[PDB]
Write a protein that binds this ligand. Sequence first.
Ligand SMILES: Nc1ccn([C@H]2C[C@H](O)[C@@H](COP(=O)(O)O)O2)c(=O)n1
Ligand SMILES: [Ca+2]
Ligand SMILES: [Zn+2]
Length: 542
Amino acid sequence: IEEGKLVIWINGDKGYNGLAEVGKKFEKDTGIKVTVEHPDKLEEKFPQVAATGDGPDIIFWAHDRFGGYAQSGLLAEITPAAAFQDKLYPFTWDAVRYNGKLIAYPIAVEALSLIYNKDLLPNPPKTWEEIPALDKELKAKGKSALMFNLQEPYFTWPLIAADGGYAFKYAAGKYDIKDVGVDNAGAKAGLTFLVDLIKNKHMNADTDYSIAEAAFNKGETAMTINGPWAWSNIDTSAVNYGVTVLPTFKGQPSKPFVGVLSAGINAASPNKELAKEFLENYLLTDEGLEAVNKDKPLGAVALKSYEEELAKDPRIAATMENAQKGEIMPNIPQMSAFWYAVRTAVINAASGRQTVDAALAAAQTNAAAEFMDPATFTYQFKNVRWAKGRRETYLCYVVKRSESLDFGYLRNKNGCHVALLFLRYISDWDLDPGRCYRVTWFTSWSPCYDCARHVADFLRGNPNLSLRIFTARLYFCEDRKAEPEGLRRLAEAGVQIAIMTYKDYEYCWNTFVENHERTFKAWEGLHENSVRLSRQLRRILQ
DNA sequence: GTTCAAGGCCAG
DNA sequence: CTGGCCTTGAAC
Ligand SMILES: Nc1ccn([C@H]2C[C@H](O)[C@@H](COP(=O)(O)O)O2)c(=O)n1
Ligand SMILES: [Ca+2]
Ligand SMILES: [Zn+2]
């Protein structure tokens, strides 16, 4: 990666010609040549090229991915003067904050907003409470009052979070994975209001994104909840429409998930200061953001002055208002487990195949943290000799597909070994047998014969699951004849059986245990017993 | 008095 | 080496 040269990466849907002209101005004034590129899957390409000390100097992308980029140390820390931080809206600086330090510059803002038909509705409602009544008046003209993408949780969430609902609480630049406001009085209030809308068939509950877009754009529905990304379509449908504040539930504004288009600096770049100069003095200006805007819209912008210039468009003003009344979409990994655990919980509560409090309790306990005790982990997972005197078996699990879904741990309970309890857990949890899942195990004791048979059968029945088992110790009762054949039976079923090495103990120590920012402490004889036990295992399977 | 973590010795 | 078995210091 060169010095004195700036390489900028921006997605294809965002206007790169105006940004390129900004770079031409920067080269005109300074002499540093700027080259902008719009590759494909740059959100995928950037981590790999950046891990090698290569890639772009600056990367433009939504702020949520920048958290994953920040955990991998691929983003330099920025310390812009408070005089510059005052130039942008304050809540936009929270979307570029990761682990307590700024990793990117806020550029653009996106959020859900209410899109209504001006002809059918000259005065849109300001409250969800007015929606049923209105619908009954419009169901007589052959019209629906409101239809949106009830399947995905990004669209139904604003009404849920309007009253005391949230994903994870946020002390400064910090989220708390342990606390999830999915189960709450107000969250149940919003969800039950949604269910009261779908019971009366004000919304058929089968509505997806395209059904609601075809419905609204062909004049059928009077209102739909959507973002700027679809505006262009409604502009060619010849429909006269408007964008406005999302209605308020219980008098409280609904909270959509705000996405912040951001410009981050590659940590491997030698041109960090050149990048900060370009971004602070050329991009983040009225002239820079306007030059970018004329090519392709940015929606609302974080720069106060230019956002005031753009608010003359009532649509963009609505976008910024709903953004300020909403909440920043978190950038941490657990958010994935959130989406999934909510994506089902509303659907089950939508069709009526599960009651509200059950769906929301299961959703909260699903996407939430629970961590093991450090003394408990160290006691239960010690691979030594003289470890046969341990009764309880602990199992730390990870469910992924690459989307790392729920993780946690299970222990022994009333005769039910941990493997069977995980079979009941993953069975109560529904499955979509069109996509494979990759399940990882960390066990105190390896599976016994009954557990090997039950698990191997479960694997025969659900051939989309693929399991790997890391065990601390090898268990035998009636040594040398029962368990080795059971472990070979799991081997026949295609279960990757390894014995935990040191790196596995690090992974478990930093993944499943509540360590209190304490480094992992290996005991005496860990490696010796590990190669030991791995030798016995290689002797067993092969 | 009793239970347990830990370690070493010896015989296969 | 691997597995089986006693001793011990110290904690419940
Ligand atoms: N795959 C295995 C094998 C054994 N065990 C533990 C749990 C049981 O409590 C005990 C079974 O043996 P017993 O009940 O005879 O002690 O060993 C376990 O948790 N998981
Ligand atoms: Ca969990
Ligand atoms: Zn078992």
